[PDB]
Structure formats: structure tokens, C-alpha cells
């Protein structure tokens, strides 16, 4: 058996089932005090061995500096998301808003603009081009049926806290999820969390947090929130080293001050942004990406000089036409090309 | 539908079983009887003088491990005449709260008086295993309800086109006051009854006035559970919860169930008077807290991959003056996967059905409508965006009233 450690207040611990969304259960495993204890291991850690655990054969897939200590650095190795020529979303991302290991990405998403499809495509791109990366998809407040759709169909560690889970439990799934990923980076892995979404993560933390803040506006107690910020802020590359990429959605144009608000508190805190367009979605042009508002710092770290200059030109012409003319033009050329490579040859 | 069924359960039984029941009941000459006749006699026993009849109700298993069958007729809802179920039965048949148990029942004897279930004949309508509702794989609906019946019943023609409901839908009828929401429910209940007679239809009326219930009753048909303006709120929650549990047992046994919930808003309000204060809120003044409870309710709706489906179409009361109502509509945003939005403005002008089409839709409708119909609905939408509201709905109603069917209507596009 195997699972995700959960050191209890005394000193003993259980292993959580991913297939349980990391929630408590029998059959959860049991673990010494004491083993721990040396062994020397903390929460988030993944244990496997014979079972009730007679003994441990691997912690995190292996028989170590601490996360907060690791030296943070800019992302320096790109994710190549492009696979099949018809998946336009990832072809565009690789050009206009590349994502690297350690990226702190925001997908800005108005209602019904294909946010979930893009997530799955990003997830599948990394699975194909970067099989050794560990992929996690955390869904907070998700509709139950969207879970099974995302899970089959990507790969793919999908942990979910659906809108009918009790709030304090929704939170524990999120935090344990983060701890597990931090543990893995410590062990030199490249890790990705696709988070749908920060908005709802936020809202969950609102309901459950107690209740002292500097006055509401949500009604939202600044205390949030934290801790969602601390979640998103955890993304980083490291010297010593391993990366945590976080691509998280931020909801917009949903009609909620909550919500707004919320968005306001996150607006601009990413170092990679992919904005989705309602007008382009109503339109009904997909992927509904607003390329002009999308991008990443400091992208010559990710794009070679040749590519970057061409994308710059695409930008200037494009900034000189409507969004739909976009887009459209770019989607056509894409469109007619069996790779971004070839597409680039034509500039 | 009661009823209902009842005839329905007996029809599905092989002769051997029907014969065992008829004997138990001491029907004179049951072999000579035409089946349908035998079934009427079996039902008629209740109200004669034999003290064995054929009955059913829905299991509440008590902490001590014995149970009673609550009765739909009493909205579920304590009596005698409830039917006692022993621990032996619960254990041997592996029964659960919510199960519909049918059988030969001994009447109060003087004797032993209570009603006793002396012989169990069906569980959830299936002759005499179970995966739990919670372990089934939730999924999008993949089969549609066809609601359209009579060509002049416009609400359903529009729903079928603009906001299709399928088996497993979590649907929300957004209803400002008056409205016309009650009639929508009735017409939905109805289309499903004519076009899909095997679906179990439950209308759950939360804390509403008697007349409204009647009505309605009345009215339908469908199992109608309402329990009633003047009962304590923790009693009301209990009605709704047992109703839900029963639906879940049905799905476990592969039925397609529909609950038409009037309304979620009021369900929400009840859980507020009822749930141990959380110390936070809100406001409101509404918890929290839940909330989590009405959310679980609505959220139970789903198609499942390994069993039946639970469709929940719930009214959501909007533009009321509160407030606490508002907060709840807020808290339920993005939970559903189907929306039928009704217009306050189009209501005051006497245009029914008062539907705002452009704002109404259903997610993953490609699973429910063929490509042709989708693109044709799409243009209808384009043209609708080019006018009111009043004018769009009006044009469309007009084109509908000119046609014998929706497929007719689409031939025109
Ligand atoms: O595989 U489990 O509680
Ligand atoms: O990727 U989807 O209902
Ligand atoms: O609602 U706009 O690119
Ligand atoms: O993103 U710079 O020299
Ligand atoms: O269908 U006959 O007695
Ligand atoms: O005797 U004759 O239905
Ligand atoms: O079915 U009576 O009291
Ligand atoms: Na959406
Ligand atoms: Na607003």
C-alpha cells in the first residue's frame, strides 16, 4: 500500500488516499511515532510499503532541504505544451504566454469561456512532452460531474472538493495537497498544480475563517486570504532544487461582488497570465484567448531570440486590428500548419 | 402515479409471486381470475375484512435497529398507520433508510396492533447486490427528457430547444414573483409523465400554504410530498431528507428519478432556522453553515455511470425584497448545469410562458441535442440578441403556435 502522510497533533500519523481526495477513511494506513520518527519525515510525504505498515520501501518514490528554505529562482526551463496541431490553445500558449517550471500562472476566466478545456489541454501537453513531471489538478467547489470528466481524460492527479463538501474539509484537502507538492519539490521533482480556482479557494477560506478582519467588503473578511495568497505564492523554481508550477484560475464577470473582489486582491500577482475573452466566447470563437493581454515575465528566459521577435511582430499587428480579427487570422494560419515550427517559418 | 404503480409493481411480478400474495391474502379463486382482475382484488384487500393486505412505504431505520415504513400518503410523517419492520428483516434483506418496501401486511390484531410486515415482496419495486449512491460515478446526462407534448404547451417546446433537461440534470428555474413558475413545474412533470412513464416523479413542496398544495395535488400527476405550512421546521427538513434518501435508493436500483423542488430557496431558509448557530453570518442573516445542507441536496442530482439518474429541477426565488433570499441565490451560483430563467418584466405584461431565452441554457447540451438542432437553435439565439425580450419571445411564440411540432418548427428555419 501507499498514501499521503498526515502527522496528528500528538505524534502518530495516517496515510491519506488520493482516491479519497485525501480525506480521512478506513482504509487509511497507520504509522509509528516513532516511524516517523527517524525515518524523520513530515506531512505531505508519500509512503509505500507492505501492509498497518510492516515497513517502508519508499518515501516519495525513493528509498533534503526544507521547502521554505530552498533558494527561489526564476523559471529557466520551458514547458512545451504543443502536441497535436489542432489543439490551438497550447500552440498559442507556447508562443504568447509560455509557461516554465516554477511558473506562477493565472488564467483569467469569465463565465463559459472554455476555462476547463484549456486546463485539461495544459495538463495533457505536460503529460506528453514531460512525462517525469508530476501533474496535480485540484478542484475546489467543483461540480461532481466535472470531476469525473476531468479525471478520465487527463493524467492526472485529480483531487476534488466539490461544492457540496463541508467547507472545513474542502480546506484540508487543499492544504494537504499543497504540502504534498512542497514535499515533492524537496525531493527534486518538477510539480504542477492546476488549480480551479483561486476565487473559490478564497471563498471557502472566507466561510471557514473566524471572523475578526479589518471590516468586510465581500462581505469578505480580509483574513481570507491569506492563505490562498500563500497558496499561489508557493509557486517557484529552486536552486537546490525542483519546481512548483501553479496555474490557477481567477474568475471574472460572474456578477458577484464577492468574487470581484477577490479578483481585485489577486489582480496582477502572477508572473504568467492567460486572459480569456467573454466577447470572443460569446462569439463563439475558441480558444477564446485575448493574446494582447496574455503574457509572461521574463520570456527570453523561455523563448529563443528568433521566436521572440516574430511573436513581437504578431503582437504589433494584432494590436492594430480587432480582437476577432485577432485571431481568426492567427487561428487560420494555425489553422494551415502542422506545427508552430512551420507556422513560424511563414513569418 | 401513486398508485400508481402499485398496479405497476404487481404487473411486473411473475405469476408465481403474484400467486403467493393472493394466497396469503386469501383471495377466493385467484387462479381463475384474469391477471388484471387479480391485481385489483389484491389491492382491494386493504379496505375489506381480511386483515392481510398488500402495502408499501418507505423505511426509516431507527437507531435501535428496527424500522417503520413511512407513507407517501401522509407526506412521511408519523402514524400508525406506519408499518413495523423488524431487525431480522433489516438485517436479512440488508435494507437501508429510504428503501421502498412492499409486501403482505398484517393489520392491527387485538391481537398485536400495530401493522406488521409479515412478508416482503419487493424492495424499491424490484422483486427481492447494492452499490451505494455515493460510490457511483457522477456524470453528465446522456439521454434527454423529451418534454414536448401538446403543440400549444409552449413552455416545454422552448425548454426542449433552448434549455434541454436530461436524465441526471441539476436544473434551476429562476423565478421572480409571479412568475408562472408553478405551471412550469406542472408542465415539466407532465411531459415527463407522458413521454417517459418509467421515470419516478416526485414533487417536493417545502413549507407552503395548503391551497397552493392542493392544487397542484390535483393537478399533477406525480407523487406529491409536501409537509405543510404549519409543521415544525425540523420536521420539514426530515421530510425532505427522507424524500432524497428514497430517490437515492431508487437510483441505486437503476431507476430514473425526478424531484421537482418548489423551492430551494425555502428549503434553504428552513435549514437556517434549524441548524446549530455557527457564530458567523453573513448577512443574511444567514449562516454558513449551512447552506451546506441544501447544497448537498441539490448536489445529489446526477447521472451516474453504473446506475440510474437523479434529476432535480429546483425553483430559485429571485427579486423578492430579501435579502436572505438574495444571499442564497448568490451562494448557489455555478452549482447547477441547467437554467430556465423567467422574466419579471414579461410576467407583468401577461406573456406566458415568461421565459428569458437568451439567459436560459444547459451545459454540455451537445450530449442532449443533435448537431442540426444545435446550430438552428444557435441562429435563433443570434436573432434573439437583435431584439427585446418581449419581441423575441413574442416572435417565437408566434412561430410555435403556427406549427404542429418542434421538428415541424425547425423544418422552417
Ligand atoms: O481506496 U479508500 O477510504
Ligand atoms: O472540460 U468539461 O463539462
Ligand atoms: O467582454 U471582452 O475581449
Ligand atoms: O523580462 U527582461 O532584460
Ligand atoms: O399488462 U396486465 O394483467
Ligand atoms: O369481469 U372484468 O375488466
Ligand atoms: O396512508 U395514512 O395515517
Ligand atoms: Na464556466
Ligand atoms: Na456586480
PDB file of N, CA, C and O in Angstrom, chain B residues 254-313:
ATOM      1  N   UNK B 254     -31.346   1.461 -10.175  1.00  0.00           N
ATOM      2  CA  UNK B 254     -31.391   1.774 -11.585  1.00  0.00           C
ATOM      3  C   UNK B 254     -32.598   2.498 -12.083  1.00  0.00           C
ATOM      4  O   UNK B 254     -32.890   2.450 -13.245  1.00  0.00           O
ATOM      5  N   UNK B 255     -33.319   3.179 -11.231  1.00  0.00           N
ATOM      6  CA  UNK B 255     -34.405   3.973 -11.766  1.00  0.00           C
ATOM      7  C   UNK B 255     -33.923   5.362 -12.228  1.00  0.00           C
ATOM      8  O   UNK B 255     -32.863   5.824 -11.845  1.00  0.00           O
ATOM      9  N   UNK B 256     -34.723   6.003 -13.061  1.00  0.00           N
ATOM     10  CA  UNK B 256     -34.546   7.396 -13.381  1.00  0.00           C
ATOM     11  C   UNK B 256     -35.532   8.122 -12.512  1.00  0.00           C
ATOM     12  O   UNK B 256     -36.743   7.909 -12.623  1.00  0.00           O
ATOM     13  N   UNK B 257     -35.033   8.965 -11.626  1.00  0.00           N
ATOM     14  CA  UNK B 257     -35.911   9.686 -10.704  1.00  0.00           C
ATOM     15  C   UNK B 257     -35.910  11.168 -11.000  1.00  0.00           C
ATOM     16  O   UNK B 257     -34.885  11.739 -11.366  1.00  0.00           O
ATOM     17  N   UNK B 258     -37.060  11.801 -10.842  1.00  0.00           N
ATOM     18  CA  UNK B 258     -37.094  13.250 -10.899  1.00  0.00           C
ATOM     19  C   UNK B 258     -37.723  13.856  -9.645  1.00  0.00           C
ATOM     20  O   UNK B 258     -38.809  13.474  -9.212  1.00  0.00           O
ATOM     21  N   UNK B 259     -37.025  14.819  -9.061  1.00  0.00           N
ATOM     22  CA  UNK B 259     -37.608  15.571  -7.982  1.00  0.00           C
ATOM     23  C   UNK B 259     -37.796  16.958  -8.523  1.00  0.00           C
ATOM     24  O   UNK B 259     -36.896  17.520  -9.082  1.00  0.00           O
ATOM     25  N   UNK B 260     -38.993  17.482  -8.385  1.00  0.00           N
ATOM     26  CA  UNK B 260     -39.295  18.850  -8.786  1.00  0.00           C
ATOM     27  C   UNK B 260     -39.422  19.603  -7.498  1.00  0.00           C
ATOM     28  O   UNK B 260     -40.403  19.419  -6.800  1.00  0.00           O
ATOM     29  N   UNK B 261     -38.433  20.415  -7.156  1.00  0.00           N
ATOM     30  CA  UNK B 261     -38.406  21.013  -5.849  1.00  0.00           C
ATOM     31  C   UNK B 261     -38.862  22.464  -5.847  1.00  0.00           C
ATOM     32  O   UNK B 261     -38.148  23.346  -6.351  1.00  0.00           O
ATOM     33  N   UNK B 262     -40.055  22.710  -5.287  1.00  0.00           N
ATOM     34  CA  UNK B 262     -40.521  24.069  -5.015  1.00  0.00           C
ATOM     35  C   UNK B 262     -40.372  24.385  -3.514  1.00  0.00           C
ATOM     36  O   UNK B 262     -41.189  23.952  -2.682  1.00  0.00           O
ATOM     37  N   UNK B 263     -39.337  25.117  -3.114  1.00  0.00           N
ATOM     38  CA  UNK B 263     -38.325  25.723  -3.912  1.00  0.00           C
ATOM     39  C   UNK B 263     -37.087  25.437  -3.102  1.00  0.00           C
ATOM     40  O   UNK B 263     -37.187  24.953  -2.000  1.00  0.00           O
ATOM     41  N   UNK B 264     -35.918  25.781  -3.619  1.00  0.00           N
ATOM     42  CA  UNK B 264     -34.649  25.535  -2.935  1.00  0.00           C
ATOM     43  C   UNK B 264     -34.469  26.626  -1.928  1.00  0.00           C
ATOM     44  O   UNK B 264     -34.032  26.413  -0.797  1.00  0.00           O
ATOM     45  N   UNK B 265     -34.821  27.813  -2.361  1.00  0.00           N
ATOM     46  CA  UNK B 265     -34.760  28.991  -1.518  1.00  0.00           C
ATOM     47  C   UNK B 265     -35.375  28.709  -0.156  1.00  0.00           C
ATOM     48  O   UNK B 265     -34.782  28.984   0.862  1.00  0.00           O
ATOM     49  N   UNK B 266     -36.566  28.128  -0.146  1.00  0.00           N
ATOM     50  CA  UNK B 266     -37.277  27.945   1.088  1.00  0.00           C
ATOM     51  C   UNK B 266     -36.713  26.746   1.790  1.00  0.00           C
ATOM     52  O   UNK B 266     -36.743  26.658   3.002  1.00  0.00           O
ATOM     53  N   UNK B 267     -36.186  25.797   1.033  1.00  0.00           N
ATOM     54  CA  UNK B 267     -35.515  24.714   1.681  1.00  0.00           C
ATOM     55  C   UNK B 267     -34.367  25.349   2.479  1.00  0.00           C
ATOM     56  O   UNK B 267     -34.111  24.990   3.620  1.00  0.00           O
ATOM     57  N   UNK B 268     -33.669  26.290   1.842  1.00  0.00           N
ATOM     58  CA  UNK B 268     -32.511  26.927   2.447  1.00  0.00           C
ATOM     59  C   UNK B 268     -32.905  27.603   3.749  1.00  0.00           C
ATOM     60  O   UNK B 268     -32.307  27.380   4.809  1.00  0.00           O
ATOM     61  N   UNK B 269     -33.953  28.406   3.662  1.00  0.00           N
ATOM     62  CA  UNK B 269     -34.425  29.144   4.800  1.00  0.00           C
ATOM     63  C   UNK B 269     -34.716  28.207   5.936  1.00  0.00           C
ATOM     64  O   UNK B 269     -34.378  28.491   7.079  1.00  0.00           O
ATOM     65  N   UNK B 270     -35.308  27.066   5.645  1.00  0.00           N
ATOM     66  CA  UNK B 270     -35.603  26.179   6.737  1.00  0.00           C
ATOM     67  C   UNK B 270     -34.323  25.725   7.423  1.00  0.00           C
ATOM     68  O   UNK B 270     -34.223  25.718   8.641  1.00  0.00           O
ATOM     69  N   UNK B 271     -33.325  25.350   6.650  1.00  0.00           N
ATOM     70  CA  UNK B 271     -32.125  24.806   7.268  1.00  0.00           C
ATOM     71  C   UNK B 271     -31.451  25.851   8.169  1.00  0.00           C
ATOM     72  O   UNK B 271     -30.496  25.552   8.894  1.00  0.00           O
ATOM     73  N   UNK B 272     -31.968  27.075   8.103  1.00  0.00           N
ATOM     74  CA  UNK B 272     -31.387  28.195   8.787  1.00  0.00           C
ATOM     75  C   UNK B 272     -32.010  28.247  10.143  1.00  0.00           C
ATOM     76  O   UNK B 272     -31.327  28.425  11.150  1.00  0.00           O
ATOM     77  N   UNK B 273     -33.315  28.079  10.197  1.00  0.00           N
ATOM     78  CA  UNK B 273     -33.966  28.090  11.479  1.00  0.00           C
ATOM     79  C   UNK B 273     -33.534  26.879  12.275  1.00  0.00           C
ATOM     80  O   UNK B 273     -33.762  26.795  13.461  1.00  0.00           O
ATOM     81  N   UNK B 274     -32.882  25.941  11.613  1.00  0.00           N
ATOM     82  CA  UNK B 274     -32.794  24.598  12.147  1.00  0.00           C
ATOM     83  C   UNK B 274     -31.397  24.242  12.605  1.00  0.00           C
ATOM     84  O   UNK B 274     -31.237  23.580  13.616  1.00  0.00           O
ATOM     85  N   UNK B 275     -30.388  24.706  11.874  1.00  0.00           N
ATOM     86  CA  UNK B 275     -29.000  24.318  12.140  1.00  0.00           C
ATOM     87  C   UNK B 275     -28.340  25.071  13.302  1.00  0.00           C
ATOM     88  O   UNK B 275     -28.414  26.300  13.376  1.00  0.00           O
ATOM     89  N   UNK B 276     -27.691  24.329  14.219  1.00  0.00           N
ATOM     90  CA  UNK B 276     -26.955  24.925  15.333  1.00  0.00           C
ATOM     91  C   UNK B 276     -26.142  26.119  14.869  1.00  0.00           C
ATOM     92  O   UNK B 276     -25.211  25.944  14.082  1.00  0.00           O
ATOM     93  N   UNK B 277     -26.496  27.329  15.348  1.00  0.00           N
ATOM     94  CA  UNK B 277     -25.761  28.552  15.031  1.00  0.00           C
ATOM     95  C   UNK B 277     -24.264  28.277  14.909  1.00  0.00           C
ATOM     96  O   UNK B 277     -23.715  27.490  15.688  1.00  0.00           O
ATOM     97  N   UNK B 278     -23.614  28.912  13.935  1.00  0.00           N
ATOM     98  CA  UNK B 278     -22.187  28.676  13.688  1.00  0.00           C
ATOM     99  C   UNK B 278     -21.316  29.797  14.255  1.00  0.00           C
ATOM    100  O   UNK B 278     -20.088  29.695  14.270  1.00  0.00           O
ATOM    101  N   UNK B 279     -21.960  30.870  14.709  1.00  0.00           N
ATOM    102  CA  UNK B 279     -21.245  32.014  15.253  1.00  0.00           C
ATOM    103  C   UNK B 279     -20.816  33.017  14.199  1.00  0.00           C
ATOM    104  O   UNK B 279     -20.196  34.027  14.519  1.00  0.00           O
ATOM    105  N   UNK B 280     -21.148  32.753  12.939  1.00  0.00           N
ATOM    106  CA  UNK B 280     -20.760  33.650  11.851  1.00  0.00           C
ATOM    107  C   UNK B 280     -21.939  33.915  10.906  1.00  0.00           C
ATOM    108  O   UNK B 280     -22.747  33.021  10.667  1.00  0.00           O
ATOM    109  N   UNK B 281     -22.049  35.134  10.378  1.00  0.00           N
ATOM    110  CA  UNK B 281     -23.129  35.445   9.433  1.00  0.00           C
ATOM    111  C   UNK B 281     -23.589  36.909   9.450  1.00  0.00           C
ATOM    112  O   UNK B 281     -23.692  37.510  10.518  1.00  0.00           O
ATOM    113  N   UNK B 282     -23.841  37.491   8.274  1.00  0.00           N
ATOM    114  CA  UNK B 282     -23.460  36.887   6.991  1.00  0.00           C
ATOM    115  C   UNK B 282     -23.406  37.857   5.799  1.00  0.00           C
ATOM    116  O   UNK B 282     -22.434  37.833   5.045  1.00  0.00           O
ATOM    117  N   UNK B 283     -24.438  38.673   5.573  1.00  0.00           N
ATOM    118  CA  UNK B 283     -25.755  38.577   6.182  1.00  0.00           C
ATOM    119  C   UNK B 283     -26.652  39.038   5.038  1.00  0.00           C
ATOM    120  O   UNK B 283     -26.260  39.914   4.268  1.00  0.00           O
ATOM    121  N   UNK B 284     -27.838  38.457   4.905  1.00  0.00           N
ATOM    122  CA  UNK B 284     -28.298  37.402   5.786  1.00  0.00           C
ATOM    123  C   UNK B 284     -29.663  37.767   6.323  1.00  0.00           C
ATOM    124  O   UNK B 284     -30.547  38.187   5.577  1.00  0.00           O
ATOM    125  N   UNK B 285     -29.830  37.596   7.627  1.00  0.00           N
ATOM    126  CA  UNK B 285     -28.784  36.992   8.432  1.00  0.00           C
ATOM    127  C   UNK B 285     -28.831  35.505   8.187  1.00  0.00           C
ATOM    128  O   UNK B 285     -29.701  34.812   8.709  1.00  0.00           O
ATOM    129  N   UNK B 286     -27.916  35.008   7.370  1.00  0.00           N
ATOM    130  CA  UNK B 286     -27.927  33.601   7.045  1.00  0.00           C
ATOM    131  C   UNK B 286     -26.570  32.998   7.332  1.00  0.00           C
ATOM    132  O   UNK B 286     -25.562  33.570   6.959  1.00  0.00           O
ATOM    133  N   UNK B 287     -26.530  31.873   8.035  1.00  0.00           N
ATOM    134  CA  UNK B 287     -25.298  31.112   8.056  1.00  0.00           C
ATOM    135  C   UNK B 287     -24.904  31.023   6.591  1.00  0.00           C
ATOM    136  O   UNK B 287     -25.758  31.202   5.727  1.00  0.00           O
ATOM    137  N   UNK B 288     -23.651  30.664   6.285  1.00  0.00           N
ATOM    138  CA  UNK B 288     -22.909  29.458   6.515  1.00  0.00           C
ATOM    139  C   UNK B 288     -23.672  28.316   5.825  1.00  0.00           C
ATOM    140  O   UNK B 288     -24.011  28.474   4.648  1.00  0.00           O
ATOM    141  N   UNK B 289     -23.912  27.177   6.464  1.00  0.00           N
ATOM    142  CA  UNK B 289     -23.335  26.819   7.725  1.00  0.00           C
ATOM    143  C   UNK B 289     -24.288  25.822   8.359  1.00  0.00           C
ATOM    144  O   UNK B 289     -24.121  25.447   9.522  1.00  0.00           O
ATOM    145  N   UNK B 290     -25.264  25.340   7.589  1.00  0.00           N
ATOM    146  CA  UNK B 290     -25.362  25.580   6.151  1.00  0.00           C
ATOM    147  C   UNK B 290     -26.727  26.161   5.857  1.00  0.00           C
ATOM    148  O   UNK B 290     -27.416  26.581   6.787  1.00  0.00           O
ATOM    149  N   UNK B 291     -27.124  26.238   4.588  1.00  0.00           N
ATOM    150  CA  UNK B 291     -26.270  26.094   3.383  1.00  0.00           C
ATOM    151  C   UNK B 291     -25.650  24.754   2.935  1.00  0.00           C
ATOM    152  O   UNK B 291     -26.038  24.212   1.920  1.00  0.00           O
ATOM    153  N   UNK B 292     -24.668  24.243   3.655  1.00  0.00           N
ATOM    154  CA  UNK B 292     -24.032  23.006   3.226  1.00  0.00           C
ATOM    155  C   UNK B 292     -25.092  21.931   2.996  1.00  0.00           C
ATOM    156  O   UNK B 292     -24.885  20.985   2.238  1.00  0.00           O
ATOM    157  N   UNK B 293     -26.239  22.102   3.640  1.00  0.00           N
ATOM    158  CA  UNK B 293     -27.268  21.076   3.635  1.00  0.00           C
ATOM    159  C   UNK B 293     -28.171  21.126   2.420  1.00  0.00           C
ATOM    160  O   UNK B 293     -28.363  20.115   1.756  1.00  0.00           O
ATOM    161  N   UNK B 294     -28.749  22.297   2.133  1.00  0.00           N
ATOM    162  CA  UNK B 294     -29.425  22.444   0.864  1.00  0.00           C
ATOM    163  C   UNK B 294     -28.465  22.187  -0.312  1.00  0.00           C
ATOM    164  O   UNK B 294     -28.876  21.641  -1.334  1.00  0.00           O
ATOM    165  N   UNK B 295     -27.196  22.548  -0.162  1.00  0.00           N
ATOM    166  CA  UNK B 295     -26.222  22.255  -1.205  1.00  0.00           C
ATOM    167  C   UNK B 295     -26.039  20.770  -1.483  1.00  0.00           C
ATOM    168  O   UNK B 295     -25.964  20.376  -2.640  1.00  0.00           O
ATOM    169  N   UNK B 296     -25.945  19.957  -0.436  1.00  0.00           N
ATOM    170  CA  UNK B 296     -25.863  18.531  -0.612  1.00  0.00           C
ATOM    171  C   UNK B 296     -27.097  18.033  -1.340  1.00  0.00           C
ATOM    172  O   UNK B 296     -27.037  17.087  -2.127  1.00  0.00           O
ATOM    173  N   UNK B 297     -28.220  18.677  -1.086  1.00  0.00           N
ATOM    174  CA  UNK B 297     -29.480  18.204  -1.625  1.00  0.00           C
ATOM    175  C   UNK B 297     -29.482  18.351  -3.156  1.00  0.00           C
ATOM    176  O   UNK B 297     -29.436  17.368  -3.899  1.00  0.00           O
ATOM    177  N   UNK B 298     -29.521  19.600  -3.603  1.00  0.00           N
ATOM    178  CA  UNK B 298     -29.299  19.967  -4.993  1.00  0.00           C
ATOM    179  C   UNK B 298     -28.119  19.225  -5.616  1.00  0.00           C
ATOM    180  O   UNK B 298     -28.201  18.740  -6.757  1.00  0.00           O
ATOM    181  N   UNK B 299     -27.030  19.092  -4.886  1.00  0.00           N
ATOM    182  CA  UNK B 299     -25.854  18.482  -5.473  1.00  0.00           C
ATOM    183  C   UNK B 299     -25.926  16.990  -5.693  1.00  0.00           C
ATOM    184  O   UNK B 299     -25.074  16.413  -6.367  1.00  0.00           O
ATOM    185  N   UNK B 300     -26.919  16.347  -5.091  1.00  0.00           N
ATOM    186  CA  UNK B 300     -27.133  14.924  -5.291  1.00  0.00           C
ATOM    187  C   UNK B 300     -27.533  14.597  -6.743  1.00  0.00           C
ATOM    188  O   UNK B 300     -27.391  13.468  -7.191  1.00  0.00           O
ATOM    189  N   UNK B 301     -28.062  15.583  -7.451  1.00  0.00           N
ATOM    190  CA  UNK B 301     -28.557  15.367  -8.796  1.00  0.00           C
ATOM    191  C   UNK B 301     -27.405  15.016  -9.700  1.00  0.00           C
ATOM    192  O   UNK B 301     -26.338  15.593  -9.634  1.00  0.00           O
ATOM    193  N   UNK B 302     -27.620  14.028 -10.538  1.00  0.00           N
ATOM    194  CA  UNK B 302     -26.529  13.483 -11.312  1.00  0.00           C
ATOM    195  C   UNK B 302     -27.017  12.331 -12.145  1.00  0.00           C
ATOM    196  O   UNK B 302     -27.984  11.690 -11.847  1.00  0.00           O
ATOM    197  N   UNK B 303     -26.360  12.135 -13.251  1.00  0.00           N
ATOM    198  CA  UNK B 303     -26.458  10.920 -13.964  1.00  0.00           C
ATOM    199  C   UNK B 303     -25.328  10.112 -13.344  1.00  0.00           C
ATOM    200  O   UNK B 303     -24.415  10.647 -12.747  1.00  0.00           O
ATOM    201  N   UNK B 304     -25.408   8.809 -13.444  1.00  0.00           N
ATOM    202  CA  UNK B 304     -24.370   8.019 -12.867  1.00  0.00           C
ATOM    203  C   UNK B 304     -24.106   7.053 -13.936  1.00  0.00           C
ATOM    204  O   UNK B 304     -24.891   6.897 -14.846  1.00  0.00           O
ATOM    205  N   UNK B 305     -22.973   6.406 -13.797  1.00  0.00           N
ATOM    206  CA  UNK B 305     -22.383   5.648 -14.844  1.00  0.00           C
ATOM    207  C   UNK B 305     -22.744   4.184 -14.656  1.00  0.00           C
ATOM    208  O   UNK B 305     -22.798   3.415 -15.613  1.00  0.00           O
ATOM    209  N   UNK B 306     -23.040   3.826 -13.418  1.00  0.00           N
ATOM    210  CA  UNK B 306     -23.227   2.453 -13.054  1.00  0.00           C
ATOM    211  C   UNK B 306     -24.600   2.199 -12.566  1.00  0.00           C
ATOM    212  O   UNK B 306     -24.883   1.094 -12.133  1.00  0.00           O
ATOM    213  N   UNK B 307     -25.456   3.207 -12.598  1.00  0.00           N
ATOM    214  CA  UNK B 307     -26.803   3.050 -12.067  1.00  0.00           C
ATOM    215  C   UNK B 307     -27.748   3.988 -12.769  1.00  0.00           C
ATOM    216  O   UNK B 307     -27.524   4.341 -13.911  1.00  0.00           O
ATOM    217  N   UNK B 308     -28.806   4.403 -12.086  1.00  0.00           N
ATOM    218  CA  UNK B 308     -29.837   5.267 -12.691  1.00  0.00           C
ATOM    219  C   UNK B 308     -29.419   6.727 -12.704  1.00  0.00           C
ATOM    220  O   UNK B 308     -28.228   7.038 -12.717  1.00  0.00           O
ATOM    221  N   UNK B 309     -30.387   7.624 -12.674  1.00  0.00           N
ATOM    222  CA  UNK B 309     -30.065   9.032 -12.612  1.00  0.00           C
ATOM    223  C   UNK B 309     -31.016   9.752 -11.689  1.00  0.00           C
ATOM    224  O   UNK B 309     -32.179   9.337 -11.522  1.00  0.00           O
ATOM    225  N   UNK B 310     -30.541  10.855 -11.115  1.00  0.00           N
ATOM    226  CA  UNK B 310     -31.413  11.673 -10.297  1.00  0.00           C
ATOM    227  C   UNK B 310     -31.427  13.016 -10.897  1.00  0.00           C
ATOM    228  O   UNK B 310     -30.408  13.667 -10.974  1.00  0.00           O
ATOM    229  N   UNK B 311     -32.600  13.404 -11.353  1.00  0.00           N
ATOM    230  CA  UNK B 311     -32.845  14.706 -11.856  1.00  0.00           C
ATOM    231  C   UNK B 311     -33.498  15.562 -10.756  1.00  0.00           C
ATOM    232  O   UNK B 311     -34.529  15.191 -10.161  1.00  0.00           O
ATOM    233  N   UNK B 312     -32.907  16.722 -10.502  1.00  0.00           N
ATOM    234  CA  UNK B 312     -33.505  17.684  -9.577  1.00  0.00           C
ATOM    235  C   UNK B 312     -33.683  19.010 -10.321  1.00  0.00           C
ATOM    236  O   UNK B 312     -32.725  19.624 -10.780  1.00  0.00           O
ATOM    237  N   UNK B 313     -34.925  19.407 -10.498  1.00  0.00           N
ATOM    238  CA  UNK B 313     -35.228  20.693 -11.036  1.00  0.00           C
ATOM    239  C   UNK B 313     -35.796  21.479  -9.877  1.00  0.00           C
ATOM    240  O   UNK B 313     -36.847  21.143  -9.374  1.00  0.00           O
TER     241      UNK B 313
END
